[model samples]
Target: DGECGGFWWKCGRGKPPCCKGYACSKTWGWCAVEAP
Candidate 1:
């Protein structure tokens, strides 16, 4: 289990955030960032 801001950030990306020590779910797919 990892707990870091960047991890969260990468997770937010939705495409296997960190490859080193993080498990991403394929179900999540890719996350899109919306700008205003």
Candidate 2:
């Protein structure tokens, strides 16, 4: 897991491991880490 926006795991690798269809918010934040 990584940090993005105000929440952890907001951005990850391997097809976005967060909620379904969860995309990074342009106004919120973005992470360059990958999910395990």
Candidate 3:
């Protein structure tokens, strides 16, 4: 498995973890790559 969610996929405190270089957006609760 990829071990992480895809772009715009459900990812957040109660969802799956995000992919490398990506994080769960607090606003949408989806996976997104934001400035780190």
The lDDT leader among the candidates is 3
lDDT of 2 by residue, 1-36 (tens): 552243344443433444443454434444333333
Model 2 accuracy (lDDT, Cα)? 0.40
* Candidate 3 structure quality by residue, lDDT tens digits, 1-36: 557766667755536767887778657767777676
TM-score for candidate 1, residues paired by index: 0.23
Ten-residue stretch with the least lDDT total in model 2:
3-12
Model 1, range 1-36, lDDT digits (tens) per residue? Answer: 743233334343344435344444445542223321
Look at candidate 1 and give me any clashing residue pairs: none
Off by over 4 Å in 1: 1-6, 9-17, 27-36
Provide the clash count, candidate 3: 0
| Candidates' RMSD to native | 8.6, 9.6, 2.6
